[PDB]
Structure formats: structure tokens, C-alpha cells
Amino acid sequence: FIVDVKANKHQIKQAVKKLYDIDVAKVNTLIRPDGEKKAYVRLAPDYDALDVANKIGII
Amino acid sequence: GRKRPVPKGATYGKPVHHGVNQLKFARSLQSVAEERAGRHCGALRVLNSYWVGEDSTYKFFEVILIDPFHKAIRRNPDTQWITKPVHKHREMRGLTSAGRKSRGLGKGHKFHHTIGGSRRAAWRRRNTLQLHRYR
Amino acid sequence: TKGTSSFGKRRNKTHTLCRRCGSKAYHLQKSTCGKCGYPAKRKRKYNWSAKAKRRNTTGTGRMRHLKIVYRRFRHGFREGTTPKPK
Amino acid sequence: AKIKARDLRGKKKEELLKQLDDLKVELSQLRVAKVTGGAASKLSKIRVVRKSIARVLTVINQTQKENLRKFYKGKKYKPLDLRPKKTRAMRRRLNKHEESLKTKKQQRKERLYPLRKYAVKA
Amino acid sequence: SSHKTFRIKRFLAKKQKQNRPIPQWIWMKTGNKIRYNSKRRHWRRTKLGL
Amino acid sequence: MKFNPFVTSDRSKNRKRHFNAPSHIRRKIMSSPLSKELRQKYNVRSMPIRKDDEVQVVRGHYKGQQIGKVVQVYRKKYVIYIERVQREKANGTTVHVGIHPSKVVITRLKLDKDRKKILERKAKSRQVGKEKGK
Amino acid sequence: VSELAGHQTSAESWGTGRAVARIPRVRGGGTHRSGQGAFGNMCRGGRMFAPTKTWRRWHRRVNTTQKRYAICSALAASALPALVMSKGHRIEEVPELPLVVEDK
Amino acid sequence: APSRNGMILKPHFHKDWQRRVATWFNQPARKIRRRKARQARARRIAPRPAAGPIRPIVRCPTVRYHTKVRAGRGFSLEELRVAGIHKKVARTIGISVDPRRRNKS
Amino acid sequence: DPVPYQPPFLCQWGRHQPAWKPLM
RNA sequence: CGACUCUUAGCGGUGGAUCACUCGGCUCGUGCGUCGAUGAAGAACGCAGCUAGCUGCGAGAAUUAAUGUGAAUUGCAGGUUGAUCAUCGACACUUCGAACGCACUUGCGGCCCCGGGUUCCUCCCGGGGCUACGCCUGUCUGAGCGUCGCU
RNA sequence: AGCCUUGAAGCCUAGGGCGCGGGCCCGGGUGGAGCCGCCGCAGGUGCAGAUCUUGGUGGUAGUAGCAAAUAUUCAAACGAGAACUUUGAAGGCCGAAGUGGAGAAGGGUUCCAUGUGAACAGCAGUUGAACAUGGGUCAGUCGGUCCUGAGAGAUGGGCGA
RNA sequence: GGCUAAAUACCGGCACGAGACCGAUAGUCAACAAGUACCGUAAGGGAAAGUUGAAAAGAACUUUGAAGAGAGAGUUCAAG
RNA sequence: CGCGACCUCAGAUCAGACGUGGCGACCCGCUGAAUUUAAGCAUAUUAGUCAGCGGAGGAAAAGAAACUAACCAGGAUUCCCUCAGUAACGGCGAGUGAACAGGGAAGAGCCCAGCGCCGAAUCCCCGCCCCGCGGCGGGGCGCGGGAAAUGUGGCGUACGGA
Ligand SMILES: [Mg+2]
Ligand SMILES: [Mg+2]
Ligand SMILES: [Mg+2]
Ligand SMILES: [Mg+2]
Ligand SMILES: [Mg+2]
Ligand SMILES: [Mg+2]
Ligand SMILES: [Mg+2]
Ligand SMILES: [Mg+2]
Ligand SMILES: [Mg+2]
Ligand SMILES: [Mg+2]
Ligand SMILES: [Mg+2]
Ligand SMILES: [Mg+2]
Ligand SMILES: [Mg+2]
Ligand SMILES: [Mg+2]
Ligand SMILES: [Mg+2]
Ligand SMILES: [Mg+2]
Ligand SMILES: [Mg+2]
Ligand SMILES: [Mg+2]
Ligand SMILES: [Mg+2]
Ligand SMILES: [Mg+2]
Ligand SMILES: [Mg+2]
Ligand SMILES: [Mg+2]
Ligand SMILES: [Mg+2]
Ligand SMILES: [Mg+2]
Ligand SMILES: [Mg+2]
Ligand SMILES: [Mg+2]
Ligand SMILES: [Mg+2]
Ligand SMILES: [Mg+2]
Ligand SMILES: [Mg+2]
Ligand SMILES: [Mg+2]
Ligand SMILES: [Mg+2]
Ligand SMILES: [Mg+2]
Ligand SMILES: [Mg+2]
Ligand SMILES: [Mg+2]
Ligand SMILES: [Mg+2]
Ligand SMILES: [Mg+2]
Ligand SMILES: [Mg+2]
Ligand SMILES: [Mg+2]
Ligand SMILES: [Mg+2]
Ligand SMILES: [Mg+2]
Ligand SMILES: [Mg+2]
Ligand SMILES: [Mg+2]
Ligand SMILES: [Mg+2]
Ligand SMILES: [Mg+2]
Ligand SMILES: [Mg+2]
Ligand SMILES: [Mg+2]
Ligand SMILES: [Mg+2]
Ligand SMILES: [Mg+2]
Ligand SMILES: [Mg+2]
Ligand SMILES: [Mg+2]
Ligand SMILES: [Mg+2]
Ligand SMILES: [Zn+2]
């Protein structure tokens, strides 16, 4: 995901848990040279990332 | 008195301005007292002040200071001239009596250098060419 | 060797961006801006620099408060009223 | 639909917040369509959704602050947001009443010696 | 440097996004006078400040 | 002469009000005469032009008796595109040629409620001026 | 012309040596206008010779009797047909040249 | 350097006089402004005289001018005391007062 | 491009230079 | 005749003078004469479907509402119970900065209240409100081998 | 009751002339929107120079030069095109105090892929750190952050217009 | 010890109006993305740069070329 | 020793306010040169100017005589014409340099403290009621609190006043 730059890993975890109804193993964040923060949101393995990506639209 | 704040001696100029030691400040010490008290208390407004004591190294002054925002001053028609913004920092502009004394203003033949509003207004009014339209 | 070869030794920096005026004139060891004197409460402005004043005056930026002050002045600084509805 | 503010003003707090959440989910999906690569119609719909969100939050803020200043109307101390903001110098003036106060001596002079209405002849 | 602050990195981030050419629809407008971005910085020629 | 001390008789100031006018002053500037039938009828000299008005071009190359519908009023260019006032581009497509509205007469007005309101208001002030002249 | 026109540069001359013609030149930098000739009436930019001041004498007083003489001469020659036609007026059909009409 | 025969003469332009030059292009605008303020004052006080209060007959000082007669600042308190006008009521009916004037004659 | 600043003179004539020296 | 050179003319390049323009100055005059702890001036970063700069704006982010206006905006797309413009009184207004919790790394806190965490059990997480110096009136809590009174 | 889109100004002219001259007027052309005579008024009013200022352009001149650190060759590929790109083979060099593999400061997207060959890379390029699109930097443990050092700097106090 | 309008000043600001002024080397540094690009560690220094046409009608198409470039055709009152 | 007054002095994220900085053409207060001129130069001059510092406002400042005069007297302040390049200052050199009267623009005057009389007759703040509430104001009810006799208010200020 691409995330607002003022966000914690805790806030990204709560937002991914609330918007798409999915639990999260961990969140890794980097800030791009563009300026955006990028979040790599690892999922708890009872969820498929491909299924939730097909849910939200990205394929 | 006021000694000249220059490094060691060294006024880089002509022998008139070589004086450093015996020089004197143009305002009195009571006006310095009023403006120190009124600079420390930026909200309060300086009414006036008076001599209470002196040493060889110090003089002591009481300075009368007023809230322009207290309802005993702000609701009193006798004393609510001070509540107006034209009387912000009278002590800095030479408007208290100890400041008025240093300005050299009064009526008559002794005070011709301030006829006009002040000494600066006098020097200004005298040093203008009025170039009229039709000359 | 005062010319070309001594210019190679220029890596450590003296100034960075000031955080009150944006310009790259905050001296890092004196901890003061040389353009506006930042830890001083007052703006550094001098009258021998007439051109340097006009680079940073009130006309220079957005005036994101002062232009609506001018607009509210031209109607007497009215408050609370709304115009007559349809 | 065309979310107009006038038929948002009568509605309740809960339906305004539910419509806000509906529009927020709608804007999220349009940003997904912008990043995956979608129609031109969704890309022009994103401005409609942004301005409708601004409208709904605006109406919420209207009905919030005018209820608060209905609440603090008679009170002598009200929040600084609800106090009148004109210029700072225009707030430190005397009141309309403190400007109208005279002393007793001055009122006695104005009672005794008014400026008469007179003319003089040729 | 590989060691940055957030302030300097955000400063460089802005200058990296200002560095693009003009879109080619901008010169099909009515009152165009702009042929190209004349504020293009190259990293060898002009050294950005600091 | 003009006598109002707050109207400008400067060239460059008037040109700057013209070419930097907002859109609701573009609408008033881009106005056009009614035909002698409509001017006899509504007692109105001229009206601002609209998208669905019928129109004769009076000056220029495309002038004639051919009543053409306005296609779209382009207030940015101070120009209007009329139904068959058009020419062929190089590749073969047709391009609308823009006429200025003052070189154009209206022959049918497109009458909504606001258009009728503007017409009755202009007729009213015309009759009041005629009465003060009387 | 404004008082500050041409004098808003800081510009020292380069002096002798350097094979240039001893005008004040613009101080340093990587721009076109640098070392480029700055004060003085003959430079590009720069002030002009004797800037026009607003205290030029714009207004002239004439004596009142001279002004009245000129009014009397201008009235006395407006009653002569040769002089009115030599001013250029088309007057050949006017009935009488001090042309007076009713007060209606 | 002076050539043959002329006035020995002293121009007072050795200072920076051009920073302080009063030009008078204000002048017909000040005449218009004063005239409009004068008429506004006249329209305000509606029957009252447009000049102001009466001012006294007054000799000029200095043997150059004591033949001449001016208008004074205000009427003396002895003049009001003899004429029977109270000095606070005199300001109300448009009589000038000043309490500085003596009367010797 | 960066307009080259005017030629940086660093003297050689004068008393230091031993090439072209006059009489004296 | 040749080549080369020189001169003149014609045409063509180089170059941008001249002329004609002019949404810009400059000068003079007039009216008003208005910033900020209710956070200013200035700065930083963001904001457009395609957008770098300028311009406008502030996470409601090339604007919201309201009023006037009455069918557009426009480079290309896409969509009269009021489009678009102007006005602008209602609302909102990120981070620095007088700049305000302490520092200026956006680092580290303290107090109170809410919700997940809990089943007030301490932590943990998120939200919200406070937390600058000086000074005035009053309030509470005090200090004094300061001056006294009573036991 | 001047001239002008039935062609103003400017500019060109082996064209006709006038004036002692400053200059001017006519014809031909180019040009596309203004201009001029006379009586007066006013000035920022006339250039060959100032090592004048700004812009442009010559001769020099197709000249000086593209000479520091040993060195390239053969075939094939792509391509419109190859001394220089790529692959292979050969011969060489740096020779572990490297021309190697990684970092600090600094730089700021130069990193990586794809495309282009205008400009730039002082020959050339199919190549590039160029240009245009797109991508890329993931931490409880690596650093910062924390501590204090030489030092810096508030408060109290002192001084100071 | 103290207050006090008016006449008076105003090259900053908001809003106007005018000119025997200047006319893109002039007039403000700035008629334009100008206190911009760029230079300097910094304070500071500081540009060049207006004009197709009435309307883009901005040259379809054929043709040599790898393309830049051309040759025809076409627009227009005129691409001289 | 304990309690209580008072007086001096502290601490509060105490209840409510106010100051901070900007701009700075105009204005007020300080500070304050040297180029320059004197055909040198030091006093003078430039010049109470430039730079520096502080503070305002829509104007500021000044301002209702411890004034001018010497008349047959004028009568706050400010501004204009004039006085007047004058009286005067000055290596008496270069240079500098007012005011009064007179004519106008404008015109407006007042308040304390003290001295004393009035039962503090005075002021602030908090609670409740009525009115108005986007310049928190008016009236009332409060054995509610404070300030104040180390002096609040009314009369009254040199033109006299009780
Ligand atoms: Mg001296
Ligand atoms: Mg002094
Ligand atoms: Mg004395
Ligand atoms: Mg250092
Ligand atoms: Mg300051
Ligand atoms: Mg009293
Ligand atoms: Mg480099
Ligand atoms: Mg009219
Ligand atoms: Mg110039
Ligand atoms: Mg001679
Ligand atoms: Mg008068
Ligand atoms: Mg040209
Ligand atoms: Mg953007
Ligand atoms: Mg709206
Ligand atoms: Mg609307
Ligand atoms: Mg640190
Ligand atoms: Mg020739
Ligand atoms: Mg034309
Ligand atoms: Mg001229
Ligand atoms: Mg020449
Ligand atoms: Mg060679
Ligand atoms: Mg390596
Ligand atoms: Mg290496
Ligand atoms: Mg090359
Ligand atoms: Mg690479
Ligand atoms: Mg792990
Ligand atoms: Mg210190
Ligand atoms: Mg007094
Ligand atoms: Mg005063
Ligand atoms: Mg006029
Ligand atoms: Mg130009
Ligand atoms: Mg030109
Ligand atoms: Mg220019
Ligand atoms: Mg040019
Ligand atoms: Mg051109
Ligand atoms: Mg042509
Ligand atoms: Mg508190
Ligand atoms: Mg201040
Ligand atoms: Mg000398
Ligand atoms: Mg000399
Ligand atoms: Mg002096
Ligand atoms: Mg100064
Ligand atoms: Mg103000
Ligand atoms: Mg005052
Ligand atoms: Mg008195
Ligand atoms: Mg006097
Ligand atoms: Mg004389
Ligand atoms: Mg002598
Ligand atoms: Mg002097
Ligand atoms: Mg006098
Ligand atoms: Mg008393
Ligand atoms: Zn700074």
C-alpha cells in the first residue's frame, strides 16, 4: 500500500484491519524518494493476499 | 555619566569626537528608570515616577504603573485616557514628565529649537525648500 | 597550493536551511541564521540593505491572513450576519 | 446522486456520518481504479466524490458550531472560537458603554450649558 | 549521503518531482507562451544548493 | 464626453478590463442585436447570446440570409460557433469558424424563465426612459 | 524618472589593469549582468544624464494686466472678418460678425 | 571662483537639500479640500454663523502697529462682567472668551 | 548553462616576475 | 575566357536594427488608512483525471457553504430544483515561525478523559484536551529571631 | 474641408533631381496602418572616437590544436550505417600500498529496465551517468535516537539608551 | 502633575483617477513561469527574454531519404 | 510554646485578563559618523544628517503661558506667506542662522493632587432574577467576598474657590 507519511505501523495495522477486515502479521514501512510512505503489510496466513487483492480490485 | 561604548579608546575620526570619558546622556536617570520599569512590564502603562533615594553608585525611583485593562481604570472616565492605544509606551517615546524634561520643549524665547512639535520637527520645518508652483 | 588543490578539501558544511526563513544560512556552530538571525525573537533587517528588505517584505509571500483582512475591512469587519436567503 | 447541501441540512447527525462513510469508501474505490488503470468516467467521478465529501463535512461543521454558539449565547465566558474575531486592535478598544461614560462634573456642565441654536442678523 | 534526515530527504523529494518536463497538452491551450520547462535541473550542471 | 470621475477613459485600462474580464462579464460583453422583428416585438435593442439561439452572420466571409443555430458560446475566445459557419481543415474534417457576436443578429431567442425576465426588465427600463423623455 | 533608477546596483569599477574601460561593473555571479557596466548615462541600464525632477518649474504667472490685455486683444480681433477667416472659420454666410442672438 | 564684478553671495545648499523638498502640487487639491470642509462645517451648524463666534476689537502690539486694529482671541472677563454675560454662557451663544486678556485702558 | 564569469586574473607582471623586467 | 582579388548591382543567407504597436512602468493627484497568542508577516510541504512552473488553495486542500448571477468550463476526456463566474458574512484553515510541554533529531516527556486492550489490573495502542515566559486583579497554600496581642 | 488599405511609417535603389551645405523631394520595389506641411510651444533633440556601454559579426582560420600514465588484432551479430557497441578468440596492462571489493563526507535519483538517437558526451556511436517513460531503498538486534567531552547556552543575579 | 479635536505630514498598504512622460538596450531589476534562472559557505549579487495570422485555416495526401531534410499538392490577401 | 491579626515575601497547569512579533512612507525618543567643503588641515562644515536601537498611530507630536512684549499692548498648540539669508554664531574664515509683531488655514477648552466639608457617601469580583445578549452592558436582590482611612467618590483648580 501507499500510506500517508504521518502514520505509525500501529496505525497502518489498525487501518488495514478495519478497511478490509483482515488480520496482519507485521507492517514494514519505507519512505520513498518520491516522498510517499510505502507499507508492506504481511498477512496472517489464514488469509490469501491474492484473494484480498482480488477483493479490492488489484490484479 | 555615559562613557562612549567604543573599543579600547579609538573613535576613528576627528579630535572633536575623540571624547569617550566625560560624556553625558541626553535623558535623565529618572527617565531611564521609567523606561526600564515600562519595558519589563509591557502590559502596564507608566504614569509617572519619583525620587526616593540615592547612593554614590545608585539612585532609586518608584514608578507608577497602571493596568489599561482593569475595570477600575477602564470604567473611569477620568483615567481612561491611558486605556487608549496612543499611550502605549509613553516612557519610550519621551512622554512622561521625566521624559518631557529631556526634550527641551516649552514656550518662549528659551525654547526656539523645538518650536513645532519637537526638535526634529523644528529642524525639518526649517530645512525644507518649499518650491511653490508659481514661485 | 592555495587555489585548485585546496578546493578539494571542501566537504564539511557551515550553513544549512534555516527553519524560520528557509534560506541556507543557518550557521551550525554559532547556531544562528545569518539571513534573519533565527534564535533572536526579532527579524534581522537592516536599512543599508534596501534591496534585501524588498526580497522579504509583506508583499512577498501569500499573505494568507492579511488579504482577507483587507477584504473584511472593505465591509467594516462584519460578523455573524448572513445575506438574505432565497 | 447530486449531493446538495440544502437537503443535507435537515437530516440528522447519524445519517450525515453514514453518508460520509459511504462517500469515503466510494473515494477509496475510485483511487484503486486510478492506480490499477480504469475508465475515464471513474477518473472524472473522483472530483464529484471529493466535493460531495467536502459538502457533507461542511454541513456537519455548520450544525456543530451553531449549536455550540446557541449553547454559549447568554454566558459571559464563551470559547475563543465563539468570541467575535475582528482585528486584534479592534478587540482591545473600550466598549460601546465605556466610551459613553461621562464624569459627574462633565454631565453637570452639559446639563447647565448646552450649545444653543442661534443665528445673527445682517 | 546515505545518512539523511527526514527534512533533507523531503527537500530532495520535492526537487525530484519538480524536475519533470511540461505535459504536451499544456501547449495546446489558448494563451500558451511556454515551450518547455526552463527550470530543469541536471545533477551534474547545477548542484541544487546545500 | 463622459463626466463620471470614476469611469476610466484610459486606453490600456479599458483593454485590461476587457481581456481580463470574468465569465459573467464575458456574457454581457458578448451580446448581439435582435432582429427588427424581435426588436419591434419585445422593445429590446439587444441581448446576450445563448447556445440555442438562431442567428444570421452579418459581416465577414460567412455572411448571408442563412439562419443558423449557435452551436456553442465560447466566452474564453470572445467568439461563438454557429451551425454551418464552418470550413474544411487540411485533412478533410470540418472546423467551426468563430464569429464575434456583434457581427451577428438574433432571429429567434431561446426563452427560458430567466431569459423572459431579462427581456421584460429591459423593456421596462426602456419604457421608463421613454416616459422621462416624454 | 524615479530617483532610484539606475542606482540599484552595487558596482565598483575594476580600476586600472584588466584592459577594460574603467566603468563601474556589476559585482560577480553567474549571470549576464555581471561585470557589465552599471552606473553612468552611456551604459545599458544605468541612470540617464540629469534625471528629470518633479521640482522643474512647470507653472508660469503672468501679470493680471497682461492677461487682461490679451483677453481684450482676443475679443477685439474676433470682430474682424479678415482675422476670423485667417484663423480658418467658414463664415461667408454669417449675417453680421459680432454675432449676437436673443436670450432665448 | 568669482569673475569680474558680482554679488558676494551665499547659497544655503551645502546640505542634502533634495531629500527635503516640499513641492506644492497638493495646492489646488488642498484648496478644494479646505473649501469642502468649510462648507461641511457651515451646513452642520445650520443657522449659526459660518465664520464662528464674535471676536473683539484689539490693538496690535509694537509701535509699528498700534494704529491698527485686529480681531482678538476672545472677550475679556471684565468685558463679560460689565456686559452681563456669564463666561460659561458666552461660549454657548457664540461669544469668544479668553481669560488671559487684561484690560488697561 | 552557467555563463562563465569574467577571466580570473592572477598577476605575474610586477616586481615578482623575473621574465620581462625593465631597467630601473 | 581561366582561378584568386577588388568594386557595384540583383537575389539568397547571417543578424535583429528601424518602424508601427503595448493587459507594463514612471510621475502627480485623490479617498481610505486595516496585522498578530481568536496565532501574524515570512517560510516548508502537500493539493487537479491527465499538471512541471506560475496562480489559487490547506487533508473539506485549482476549494465548501451562502448570496448575486443566469447556461457554461474548455487543451483533451468524463458527466434551470441552477452550470459558470463574481461577491464573500457561514464553516474549515497541515508543519515551522513572536512560536507556547522540553529539545529542534521531528527526538523525549508529564497530567486528565475516552475507545480497542480491559471486565479499573497494571502495562500496550489509538483518539481528544491540557502542559511557554512576563505581568495585573483576586483566590488558595505557605515563609519569617518583621511588628504586635492573647494564653 | 491635409494625406492614406485605389496602400501610412520604416527599409532597398546601376532611377530623376534640387540646395554651398545641413538636408530634401520625386519614380521603381518591399511593406501592411498609420503619417505629414505651416504658425507657435517644449525637450531625455543630431556621434567616429570616451582602453565608451549592449548586442551582433569578421580576418586570423579550416589555423593552433584533439601528443602524460606500453596495445591492440580477427571473425560474427544487431543495425540504414561500425576503427569505437555486443559476443567469441587472440595479444596485453593494473599486479592485493590494484585500474580490485566495500564504506565516511559530499552528491541527489546519477541506481534498474525499456525505448530514442534531435541537442550534449571537443572524432564517432547501434553507446551513455544524455533524453523520455516506467520501476526501486522493508530492521526491537545496523545506525541515529540516549550519554557526556572540549565547548555551547537559559533561569536567578549583574550590567545596559 | 495630567487630558484635548481641527487646520498639518505620508516615495509603505487597500482602492481609484490622470499625464505636453517612457515605448521593449527606453520605462521599475522585472510589459513574459522576476527578486525567477543562475553565482557565492554566507551576508548578499541578480539577468536575458514582447509581436504568425482576421481566423490555426499550423501544410491532408504523393514522393526520395535511416531520419533530419527536401520536391510537388494544399491553406491564406500574403508563407515574399 | 500554641492561636490570631497585620506587614514584607514566596509558590501555583489557581479564576479571569493583558504584553511579546511584523510593517515601518509619514511621526516620537535616543545614539550618531565619515566621505565633503575650507582649493592643505586640526576648530568649523557636511550634520543632529547616513548607518544603529527602541516605540506608536491614522496621523503622531505639541498644546491651554513659570509666553511675547515694553505698545494705545497682544493671548493655547500646529501649519502657510512674511519677517529673512535678517538679529546673531563663525580659524569673524569657508560657512551657518532663529524668533517677535503682522496677514491667513483652523479654532475648544478642560481635569487633578493639595486646602477643606460630606456617617467610604467610592471601586472591583462572584451567586440568583428581569431585559439585551457578534463592542457582556443596564436595573434589582444578596448579614456574599475583597479593595480603600498609608484616602475612594461628590463639590472644587488660580479665569479664583467654599
Ligand atoms: Mg572637525
Ligand atoms: Mg544628542
Ligand atoms: Mg530645568
Ligand atoms: Mg566550522
Ligand atoms: Mg525591530
Ligand atoms: Mg471631580
Ligand atoms: Mg562537480
Ligand atoms: Mg453616469
Ligand atoms: Mg534605466
Ligand atoms: Mg572664467
Ligand atoms: Mg478664519
Ligand atoms: Mg522587431
Ligand atoms: Mg502538484
Ligand atoms: Mg458553491
Ligand atoms: Mg450558485
Ligand atoms: Mg542529537
Ligand atoms: Mg548602394
Ligand atoms: Mg494589422
Ligand atoms: Mg522627451
Ligand atoms: Mg557608434
Ligand atoms: Mg591541423
Ligand atoms: Mg567496489
Ligand atoms: Mg572502488
Ligand atoms: Mg561529439
Ligand atoms: Mg546504468
Ligand atoms: Mg525477524
Ligand atoms: Mg549568553
Ligand atoms: Mg502643565
Ligand atoms: Mg500630550
Ligand atoms: Mg484632470
Ligand atoms: Mg527587451
Ligand atoms: Mg524594437
Ligand atoms: Mg529592461
Ligand atoms: Mg531584444
Ligand atoms: Mg521579430
Ligand atoms: Mg506580406
Ligand atoms: Mg489560570
Ligand atoms: Mg512592536
Ligand atoms: Mg579639504
Ligand atoms: Mg580641493
Ligand atoms: Mg551638528
Ligand atoms: Mg537613521
Ligand atoms: Mg495601525
Ligand atoms: Mg496626541
Ligand atoms: Mg493652567
Ligand atoms: Mg507665538
Ligand atoms: Mg528682504
Ligand atoms: Mg581670518
Ligand atoms: Mg548647523
Ligand atoms: Mg507670529
Ligand atoms: Mg478627595
Ligand atoms: Zn533564518
mmCIF file of N, CA and C (backbone and C1' of nucleotides) and ligand atoms in Angstrom, chain J residues 66-70 82-86, ligand 15:
data_model
loop_
_atom_site.group_PDB
_atom_site.id
_atom_site.type_symbol
_atom_site.label_atom_id
_atom_site.label_comp_id
_atom_site.label_asym_id
_atom_site.label_seq_id
_atom_site.Cartn_x
_atom_site.Cartn_y
_atom_site.Cartn_z
ATOM 1 P P A J 66 -25.808 26.440 0.047
ATOM 2 O "O5'" A J 66 -25.821 27.964 0.489
ATOM 3 C "C5'" A J 66 -26.380 28.393 1.717
ATOM 4 C "C4'" A J 66 -26.069 29.844 1.939
ATOM 5 C "C3'" A J 66 -26.508 30.774 0.831
ATOM 6 O "O3'" A J 66 -27.871 31.122 0.909
ATOM 7 C "C1'" A J 66 -24.288 31.258 1.411
ATOM 8 P P U J 67 -28.749 31.157 -0.421
ATOM 9 O "O5'" U J 67 -28.464 32.600 -1.026
ATOM 10 C "C5'" U J 67 -28.620 33.759 -0.227
ATOM 11 C "C4'" U J 67 -27.870 34.945 -0.777
ATOM 12 C "C3'" U J 67 -28.087 35.268 -2.241
ATOM 13 O "O3'" U J 67 -29.300 35.953 -2.478
ATOM 14 C "C1'" U J 67 -25.787 35.403 -1.732
ATOM 15 P P G J 68 -30.060 35.810 -3.884
ATOM 16 O "O5'" G J 68 -29.122 36.557 -4.921
ATOM 17 C "C5'" G J 68 -29.234 37.952 -5.124
ATOM 18 C "C4'" G J 68 -28.082 38.474 -5.932
ATOM 19 C "C3'" G J 68 -28.088 38.106 -7.397
ATOM 20 O "O3'" G J 68 -28.970 38.889 -8.174
ATOM 21 C "C1'" G J 68 -25.952 37.718 -6.522
ATOM 22 P P U J 69 -29.925 38.177 -9.238
ATOM 23 O "O5'" U J 69 -28.930 37.684 -10.362
ATOM 24 C "C5'" U J 69 -28.123 38.599 -11.073
ATOM 25 C "C4'" U J 69 -27.004 37.878 -11.761
ATOM 26 C "C3'" U J 69 -27.431 36.904 -12.826
ATOM 27 O "O3'" U J 69 -27.721 37.564 -14.036
ATOM 28 C "C1'" U J 69 -25.754 35.932 -11.488
ATOM 29 P P G J 70 -29.211 37.597 -14.602
ATOM 30 O "O5'" G J 70 -29.257 36.321 -15.527
ATOM 31 C "C5'" G J 70 -28.241 36.142 -16.499
ATOM 32 C "C4'" G J 70 -27.778 34.714 -16.600
ATOM 33 C "C3'" G J 70 -28.713 33.778 -17.352
ATOM 34 O "O3'" G J 70 -27.948 32.843 -18.096
ATOM 35 C "C1'" G J 70 -28.414 33.006 -15.132
ATOM 36 P P G J 82 -30.835 23.831 -7.317
ATOM 37 O "O5'" G J 82 -30.388 24.021 -8.823
ATOM 38 C "C5'" G J 82 -29.404 23.184 -9.409
ATOM 39 C "C4'" G J 82 -28.630 23.931 -10.458
ATOM 40 C "C3'" G J 82 -27.534 24.835 -9.914
ATOM 41 O "O3'" G J 82 -26.395 24.810 -10.760
ATOM 42 C "C1'" G J 82 -29.125 26.136 -11.107
ATOM 43 P P A J 83 -24.956 24.621 -10.090
ATOM 44 O "O5'" A J 83 -23.954 24.547 -11.308
ATOM 45 C "C5'" A J 83 -23.837 23.368 -12.075
ATOM 46 C "C4'" A J 83 -23.344 23.702 -13.450
ATOM 47 C "C3'" A J 83 -22.142 24.624 -13.480
ATOM 48 O "O3'" A J 83 -20.916 23.941 -13.340
ATOM 49 C "C1'" A J 83 -23.790 25.427 -14.953
ATOM 50 P P U J 84 -19.820 24.460 -12.296
ATOM 51 O "O5'" U J 84 -19.304 25.826 -12.919
ATOM 52 C "C5'" U J 84 -18.709 25.873 -14.206
ATOM 53 C "C4'" U J 84 -18.754 27.271 -14.762
ATOM 54 C "C3'" U J 84 -18.107 28.320 -13.889
ATOM 55 O "O3'" U J 84 -16.703 28.353 -14.047
ATOM 56 C "C1'" U J 84 -20.215 29.092 -14.620
ATOM 57 P P C J 85 -15.808 29.200 -13.033
ATOM 58 O "O5'" C J 85 -15.741 30.628 -13.715
ATOM 59 C "C5'" C J 85 -15.299 31.759 -12.993
ATOM 60 C "C4'" C J 85 -16.211 32.934 -13.201
ATOM 61 C "C3'" C J 85 -16.250 33.907 -12.050
ATOM 62 O "O3'" C J 85 -15.161 34.803 -12.056
ATOM 63 C "C1'" C J 85 -18.449 33.414 -12.731
ATOM 64 P P A J 86 -14.131 34.817 -10.831
ATOM 65 O "O5'" A J 86 -14.669 35.998 -9.928
ATOM 66 C "C5'" A J 86 -14.844 37.284 -10.487
ATOM 67 C "C4'" A J 86 -16.092 37.943 -9.972
ATOM 68 C "C3'" A J 86 -16.136 38.200 -8.488
ATOM 69 O "O3'" A J 86 -15.383 39.327 -8.112
ATOM 70 C "C1'" A J 86 -18.202 37.332 -9.198
HETATM 71 MG MG MG N 15 -24.678 29.135 -7.002
#
